[PDB]
């Protein structure tokens, strides 16, 4: 097991540690591709976590700095300020593959920005956030999961990224509340006559259900769009990408079954995951 290999494995560990779904799925990619995926995810994972370190930025800029470095001189050695195991893997990728560097910045910008989180006025702000945090990730991933990236590829991938984020939001309503965050828009809330603090104490009612389902619909629909254009992705990637999607949609029927609880994280059993993989796998 060589030296890069050792990096990609930290990267892998990190991915596997955060999201069990993504890993379940993207691990079934070919060697070349899944290792690049691992690199990217880890970089991003770091970017999100860079805040809970000292209680201040630092890092984040380092990470920005190490990235900006690779962007510039990809074939020179760098002494990375942040995490070296990761920045290495990425550099390796960056050699063999195109990288939407901008999108990393977009994501970093989004994280800088989230320090002064005020609630969203309107769904537009919400949708703008989803872009920042996930639409960006989809773009970065695009050269990895398709043979000839066209505007069209990028668009789908982004749209998938945004959807999943929306679902993860939908799943984490309680948990997010606890850390003084609410992602539903002020607008949508007033319209639906929901106060999240009140639901948290007194359990769900009909208004919450409806506001949640309003958003559940947006996701569901967007996921159907993406499924239709799955073909923009390379042949090996398609069933994998369908998998990750399916697993994530599946999260919604979970929240439903749990009666939209705000006092815990629902999950998709590993066994159900496999069941899905089988259904998809079977049709390929
Ligand atoms: C082809 C389909 C592409 C699928 C894309 C995957 C969706 C997003 O995947 C990600 C992976 C790694 C990291 C991130 C950032 S998470 C994040 C960032 C910023 C802030 Br503020 C809060 C969070 C948070 O989740 O709380 C997202
Ligand atoms: Mg979240």
């Amino acid at each position: 097991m060589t030296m890069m290999d050792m990096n990609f494995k930290y990267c892998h560990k990190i991915m596997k540690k955060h999201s069990k779904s993504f890993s379940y799925a993207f691990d079934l990619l070919p060697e070349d591709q899944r290792k690049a995926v691992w690199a990217i995810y880890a970089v991003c994972r770091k970017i999100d976590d860079s805040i809970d370190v000292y209680g201040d930025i630092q890092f984040l800029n380092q990470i920005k700095e190490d990235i900006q470095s690779i962007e510039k001189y990809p074939y020179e050695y760098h002494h990375f300020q942040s995490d070296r195991r990761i920045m290495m893997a990425l550099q390796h990728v960056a050699q063999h593959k195109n990288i939407a560097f901008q999108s990393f910045y977009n994501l970093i910008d989004t994280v800088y920005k989230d320090q002064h989180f005020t609630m969203f006025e309107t769904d537009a702000e919400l949708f703008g956030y989803c872009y920042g945090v996930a639409g960006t990730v989809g773009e970065v991933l695009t050269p990895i999961l398709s043979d000839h990236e066209t505007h069209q590829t990028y668009d789908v991938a982004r749209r998938l990224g945004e959807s999943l984020q929306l679902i993860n939001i939908l799943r984490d309503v309680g948990e997010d509340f606890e850390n003084e965050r609410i992602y539903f828009s002020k607008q949508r809330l007033k319209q639906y006559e929901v106060d999240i603090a009140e639901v948290y104490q007194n359990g769900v009612n009909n208004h919450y259900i409806d506001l949640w389902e309003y958003y559940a619909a947006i996701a569901e629909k967007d996921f159907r769009d993406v499924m239709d254009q799955i073909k923009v992705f390379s042949i090996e990637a398609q069933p994998i990408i369908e998998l990750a999607a399916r697993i994530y949609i599946e999260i919604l029927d979970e929240v439903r079954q749990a009666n939209y609880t705000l006092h815990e994280r629902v999950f998709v059993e590993k066994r159900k995951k496999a069941k899905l993989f089988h259904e998809i796998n079977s049709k390929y």
Side-chain angles (χ1 to χ4, degrees), residues 246-258:
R246 267 301 270 119
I247 296 179
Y248 259 80
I249 267 331
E250 195 52 58
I251 285 161
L252 296 165
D253 294 307
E254 295 289 350
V255 175
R256 266 159 202 144
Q257 275 147 33

Side-chain angles (χ1 to χ4, degrees), residues 48 129 165 168-169 171-172 175-176 183 265:
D48 174 33
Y129 160 88
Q165 180 56 28
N168 137 44
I169 284 182
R171 177 207 55 200
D172 284 352
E175 196 173 301
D176 295 316
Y183 292 105
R265 173 193 288 252

Side-chain angles (χ1 to χ4, degrees), residues 97-113:
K97 290 308 289 174
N98 308 341
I99 293 296
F101 289 108
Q102 179 48 64
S103 312
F104 275 124
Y105 308 140
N106 289 345
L107 166 73
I108 286 155
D109 241 328
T110 305
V111 179
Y112 278 136
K113 225 147 265 138

Side-chain angles (χ1 to χ4, degrees), residues 188-236:
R188 206 54 64 193
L189 281 175
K190 161 153 174 161
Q191 167 189 356
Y192 275 74
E193 301 158 314
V194 175
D195 164 285
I196 288 297
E198 196 278 311
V199 192
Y200 185 70
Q201 253 72 16
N202 305 2
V204 320
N205 67 31
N206 279 346
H207 299 282
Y208 175 86
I209 276 143
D210 285 4
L211 168 67
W212 187 96
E213 286 296 354
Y214 165 83
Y215 285 106
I218 297 181
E220 272 156 350
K221 198 207 161 293
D222 276 313
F223 157 90
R224 279 186 322 270
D225 290 4
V226 166
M227 292 295 95
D228 292 343
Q229 311 158 64
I230 193 101
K231 290 183 174 215
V232 306
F233 296 110
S234 85
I235 234 319
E236 317 76 74

Side-chain angles (χ1 to χ4, degrees), residues 18 22 26 41 44-45 48 107 110-111 114 129 133-134 137-138 141 145 157 160-161 164-165 168 233 241:
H18 190 72
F22 264 61
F26 290 116
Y41 190 96
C44 293
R45 212 43 248 154
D48 174 33
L107 166 73
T110 305
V111 179
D114 173 300
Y129 160 88
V133 350
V137 172
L141 291 185
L145 316 178
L160 177 51
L164 308 171
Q165 180 56 28
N168 137 44
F233 296 110
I241 279 143

Side-chain angles (χ1 to χ4, degrees), residues 7-48:
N7 295 334
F8 288 87
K9 193 209 166 159
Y10 178 49
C11 291
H12 179 192
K13 166 206 167 168
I14 295 168
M15 187 177 84
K16 194 148 191 176
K17 239 211 203 224
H18 190 72
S19 184
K20 297 268 155 2
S21 309
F22 264 61
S23 32
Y24 188 90
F26 290 116
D27 286 335
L28 314 161
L29 289 164
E31 195 57 32
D32 287 327
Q33 285 135 108
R34 75 181 125 111
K35 278 169 27 155
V37 171
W38 296 340
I40 288 150
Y41 190 96
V43 175
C44 293
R45 212 43 248 154
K46 275 316 201 200
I47 293 162
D48 174 33

